[PDB]
Design an enzyme around this catalytic site. Structure first.
Site, PDB file in Angstrom:
ATOM      1  CB  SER A 182      -0.912  -0.007   1.205  1.00  0.00           C
ATOM      2  OG  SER A 182      -1.486  -1.297   1.387  1.00  0.00           O
ATOM      3  CG  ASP A 185      -3.181   1.797   6.788  1.00  0.00           C
ATOM      4  OD1 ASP A 185      -3.042   1.416   5.632  1.00  0.00           O
ATOM      5  OD2 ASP A 185      -3.105   1.021   7.735  1.00  0.00           O
TER       6      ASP A 185
HETATM    7 ZN   LIG Z   1      -2.857  -4.820   1.865  1.00  0.00          ZN
END
Ligand SMILES: [Zn+2]
Ligand SMILES: [Zn+2]
EC number: 3.1.3.1
Lengths: 446, 446
Positions: free
Chosen positions: B99, B150
Site C-alpha cells: 500500500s 495508514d
Molecule cells: Zn494490503
C-alpha cells in the site's frame, strides 16, 4: 485510426516520471479512435484463460514490468466484461464458466450451461456468428492452436449438448440426441465438416480418423469424407504456404497435430514451495515446436491473405489455446510462451487492420484463470515457481485454487480491447453476450 | 458528460440477448464523454485491494451476476494500469507492491520501494498532489475508513522511510532520520498536522494521544497540538454534520475511531474446505457500525460540501480501506461489504460531478489482492467459503496465496475508470505514476 505505438515506461523507472507510459494528453487520440462506420471484416483473437493476471505475468517475464506488448497492449479502447454461465437446472448464474459456455456466449449471444456448445439451457440450437457471416456471403476462418474439436473453435460450427462429443463414438454415448445414427446433426467434427468455413486451421487430426456411423459417408473416415467433400487438406507449414485460394468450392482444412499443436516454451511445473526451495526458472524454447509446424502468427497471416480476397469481407476467429492448458497444468513457461504467441498473431492482425481501415480487431479471453503473481518470499499452500524475467529480477507465480492438479478457471471479469469500427462498444463494463451483438451489428448482419 | 445509467443485464439471462448490458451503439456516448477542458476539481476514490476480482465478487453477491453497481460500474472510460514497486537495493522492479509504494506512486509520480511514504529509493522526498494543490490555492480533502496514519491517507501528507512510523515513539526507533527530536520532519501524524489539509476524516485517534518529543508542542499530545493549531476536531456523525466551513484558518479533523472505522457487514472467516464442509454464508449488517459513526458516503458528501465552497476548486481523495484489510483476513463478507461501501461514496461523487460539469472522478485500486471466485465444488488448498448471492445461487471464494494467515496482494494489473475532463488519460494500458501526471495536468498544477 491510431494504434498505440508505444506505451512502455518512457524512461528510467527510478526517476520522477520515468515509469510513465503516456507522453501527453490522450483525448485527441481517443477521439480519432471512434468510428461507427460499418466494419467490413472482423478478426477476434481469444486468449484461452488470458485474464489480466496472465497478461501482466507474461509482460513482466518477456518484456519487463515497464515493457509493452506491441500486439496485446496496442489496442486503444479497453473495457471489462463479465462471463458467468447458467446452471442448467435452475437457470440461475453459475459464476465460473468453462470454455464451452463462454465460447457459446460470444458466438451466439445467449448464455448457457457449462459444457454446452451452441445450444441454450433448453438444448435449443442458436446460430453462430460464423454461420451468420457465411449466410451473408462473407468469408469465414477459424484458427486455433488447440484440437479443432475443443470448445472455442468448435463453438463456431457445432451444436451439441456436451463439449466431449468430439467424434462419432463419443457422440453416440455422450450426446445420443446429436448422434448421427440416431438422426442427430452429428459430432463436433461432422458438424464442422458440414459447416464448411473457408479456412479452418489447428490440431485435432486424431478424431478425423474415426469412421462415420451413418449418412452418405458411412464407413469412411472423417478425413476421407473431408477429401470427398472438396476440402483442401494441409498438414504442415510448407503445404499451407502453397495454398493460393481457399473458398466454398475448395475450403481449406489444415490439421497440423494429432491433438493440440506444440507449446512454444518449456519449463518445469510449479511445485509446493517451488519459490522457496528451487532455483529461479528461465524458460527455454521448445525444440519440438518445429520449422514444419506453422506458428499462430503464420496461420493468422495465411488466413488473412486467403480471406481478404473475398470482396464482401470476412470473419476470422483466432485462438491462442495453450495459455489456458498450461495454466491448468501449473506450468508458468508454457502459459507465458502462449501469451507471447498470441501477441504475435495480434500484431499481424493489427498491421492488416491499420492499412485496411475497415477491420474491427478484438482481443479478449473466454474466462479468467488461476495464476497469481505473488511476492518473492511467499509461503503459499499451492504450487509456486520463481521466474527470471527480462528485467533480471525474480517474479513468483502461484497456482493455489485446486488440489486436484488442474488449476481451475476463476470468475473475475477481464479485459476486452478493440481497434477499428464499432470498437467503442467494448469500453466500460459489458457482458460476453454483448460481444455477439457488437460483431453482428458492426458487420451489418441480420 | 453522460454517466452510464444502467448496464445491468437488460432482460432474461436465459434468453437470446437477455444478458446484454448494452442497448445500442456506444460511439456517440463515448464521443460525448471526451473533453480536454481543465478540471476544476478532482475526486479520487481508491478501493484498497479492489482489483477486478474483488469488484466481480462484490457485484455477484450484492447485485447479482447480471447486476450493476450504480457507482463503480457507471464510469464510462476504463483502462488497466500497472503498479509494480522497486527493489530499494537494485532499483529493479518488485512485482507486488504494498500500500505504501503504490500510494506514493500516484501521489508523487515516482516509483519507490515497498514501505516508503512520499520518498523515492534514495529516500528523497517528492511533493504530493495534495501539497501541490494546496500550494496552488485549491481546497484539499483526505478521507478514509482506515487509521489516518495508514499508507493511503498518509502518503498525501507525510514523507517517511517506513510506513510504520505512525507517531513519535515508532518514528524514533524505526525512522530515526525522520524523528523530530533528531531534527527530522516528524512522524506521519506530526507531518499530517503540519500539512494542514482543509478536511481530513478517518480513524486513528489512538496515535493522537502520543506526546511530541520535541518542537514547539513538546510534551503536549498530538490531539492538544491539533486543537492549539486551530483544528476543528470532530469525533462523531452529529458533530461532523454541524461543521459549516472548513478552511485553512479552521481545518477539519474528524477522528471517528481509535483504529480503523467499523466494518459494514460481518461474516465468518474462510476456512480449509469451507465450501465443502460448511453451509453457505449470508452476510449480516454489523450492529456496531453505528448511527453515530459516519459512513464513507456521508464523509464523502460532507467533504464535497465543505470543499466546494472554495471557488478555486478542490482535490479530494477518498479511501474504502477495509476491502483490503478483510481480504487479508480472508473474510468474504467484510471485503464485499466494504466494496458496497465504496460504491455508495462513488455514487455521491458522481452525482456532484454530473451537475458541476468540471470534476474528474477517478475510481481505482492501489494493488490487486488474493480472492478468487472459484467453482462451487472446488477442493482448494487454501481458505474457502460459499456465499448466498442476490441471485439465490452459491458463489465460492478462495484465498490461496499464503499460509501465514494474511492473504497477500498480487501483482495483476487492474481497472482504473474515470468520468469528466481528462478522463481519456485512463483508457488503454497506463501506469500508476501516470495517474499523478493526469491529475496534475487536469488541474493545471505546475
Ligand atoms: Zn494490503
Ligand atoms: Zn480451461
Amino acid at each position: 485510426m491510431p494504434v498505440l505505438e508505444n506505451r512502455a515506461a518512457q524512461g528510467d523507472i527510478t526517476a520522477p516520471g520515468g515509469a510513465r507510459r503516456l507522453t501527453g494528453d490522450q483525448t485527441a487520440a481517443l477521439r480519432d479512435s471512434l468510428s461507427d462506420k460499418p466494419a467490413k471484416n472482423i478478426i477476434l483473437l481469444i486468449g484461452d484463460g488470458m485474464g489480466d493476471s496472465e497478461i501482466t505475468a507474461a509482460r513482466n517475464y518477456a518484456e519487463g514490468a515497464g515493457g509493452f506488448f506491441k500486439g496485446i497492449d496496442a489496442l486503444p479502447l479497453t473495457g471489462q466484461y463479465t462471463h458467468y454461465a447458467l446452471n442448467k437446472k435452475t437457470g440461475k448464474p453459475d459464476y465460473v464458466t468453462d470454455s464451452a459456455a463462454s465460447a457459446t456466449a460470444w458466438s451466439t449471444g445467449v448464455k448457457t450451461y457449462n459444457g454446452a456448445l451452441g445450444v441454450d439451457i433448453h438444448e435449443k440450437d442458436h446460430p453462430t456468428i460464423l454461420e451468420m457471416a457465411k449466410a451473408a456471403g462473407l468469408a469465414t476462418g477459424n484458427v486455433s492452436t488447440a484440437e479443432l474439436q475443443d470448445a472455442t473453435p468448435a463453438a463456431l460450427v457445432a451444436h451439441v449438448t456436451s463439449r466431449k462429443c468430439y467424434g462419432p463414438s463419443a457422440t453416440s454415448e455422450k450426446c445420443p440426441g446429436n448422434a448421427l445414427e440416431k438422426g442427430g446433426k452429428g459430432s463436433i467434427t461432422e458438424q464442422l465438416l458440414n459447416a464448411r468455413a473457408d479456412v479452418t486451421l489447428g490440431g485435432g487430426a486424431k478424431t478425423f480418423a474415426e469412421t462415420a456411423t451413418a449418412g452418405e459417408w458411412q464407413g469412411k473416415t472423417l478425413r476421407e469424407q473431408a477429401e470427398a467433400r472438396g476440402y483442401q487438406l494441409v498438414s504442415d507449414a510448407a503445404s499451407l504456404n502453397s495454398v493460393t485460394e481457399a473458398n466454398q468450392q475448395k475450403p481449406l482444412l489444415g490439421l497440423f497435430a494429432d491433438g493440440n499443436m506444440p507449446v512454444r516454451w518449456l519449463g518445469p511445473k510449479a511445485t509446493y514451495h517451488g519459490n522457496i526451495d528451487k532455483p529461479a526458472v528461465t524458460c527455454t524454447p521448445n525444440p519440438q515446436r518445429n520449422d514444419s509446424v506453422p506458428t499462430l502468427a503464420q496461420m493468422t497471416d495465411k488466413a488473412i491473405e486467403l480471406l481478404s480476397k473475398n470482396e464482401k469481407g470476412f470473419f476470422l476467429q483466432v485462438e491462442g489455446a495453450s495459455i489456458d492448458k498450461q495454466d491448468h497444468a501449473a506450468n508458468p513457461c508454457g502459459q507465458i510462451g502462449e501469451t507471447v504467441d498470441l501477441d504475435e498473431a495480434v500484431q499481424r492482425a493489427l498491421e492488416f487492420a491499420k492499412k485496411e481501415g475497415n477491420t474491427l480487431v478484438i482481443v479478449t479471453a473466454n474466462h479468467a484463470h488461476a495464476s497469481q503473481i505473488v511476492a518473492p518470499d511467499t509461503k503459499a499452500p499451492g504450487l509456486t515457481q520463481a521466474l527470471n524475467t527480462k528485467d533480471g529480477a525474480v517474479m513468483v507465480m502461484s497456482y493455489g485454487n485446486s488440489e486436484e492438479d488442474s488449476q481451475e478457471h476463476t470468475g473475475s471479469q477481464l479485459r476486452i480491447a478493440a481497434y477499428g469500427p464499432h470498437a467503442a462498444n467494448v469500453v466500460g463494463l459489458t457482458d460476453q453476450t454483448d460481444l455477439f451483438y457488437t460483431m453482428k451489428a458492426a458487420l451489418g448482419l441480420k
